[PDB]
mmCIF file of C-alpha atoms in Angstrom:
data_model
loop_
_atom_site.group_PDB
_atom_site.id
_atom_site.type_symbol
_atom_site.label_atom_id
_atom_site.label_comp_id
_atom_site.label_asym_id
_atom_site.label_seq_id
_atom_site.Cartn_x
_atom_site.Cartn_y
_atom_site.Cartn_z
ATOM 1 C CA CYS A 193 7.350 -6.382 53.063
ATOM 2 C CA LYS A 194 9.332 -3.371 51.819
ATOM 3 C CA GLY A 195 8.416 0.018 50.319
ATOM 4 C CA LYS A 196 9.381 1.184 46.820
ATOM 5 C CA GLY A 197 12.895 2.628 46.599
ATOM 6 C CA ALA A 198 13.974 0.315 49.467
ATOM 7 C CA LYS A 199 16.294 -1.599 47.102
ATOM 8 C CA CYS A 200 15.217 -5.002 45.753
ATOM 9 C CA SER A 201 16.605 -8.309 44.428
ATOM 10 C CA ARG A 202 14.831 -9.560 41.300
ATOM 11 C CA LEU A 203 11.685 -11.471 42.320
ATOM 12 C CA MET A 204 11.797 -12.202 46.069
ATOM 13 C CA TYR A 205 8.427 -10.471 46.570
ATOM 14 C CA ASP A 206 9.636 -7.935 49.154
ATOM 15 C CA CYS A 207 8.074 -4.765 47.728
ATOM 16 C CA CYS A 208 4.854 -4.249 49.610
ATOM 17 C CA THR A 209 3.273 -2.617 46.540
ATOM 18 C CA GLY A 210 5.001 -2.890 43.143
ATOM 19 C CA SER A 211 8.076 -5.142 42.862
ATOM 20 C CA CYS A 212 11.775 -5.051 41.900
ATOM 21 C CA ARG A 213 12.409 -1.867 39.888
ATOM 22 C CA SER A 214 15.702 -0.500 38.541
ATOM 23 C CA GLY A 215 17.228 -2.704 41.278
ATOM 24 C CA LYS A 216 15.151 -1.014 43.997
ATOM 25 C CA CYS A 217 11.609 -1.912 45.090
#
């Protein structure tokens, strides 16, 4: 999983807590 701010895609479910945000986790 990833931590917020660690960039994100759109809905891959990488953010350990929240999810995709402003492009970042």
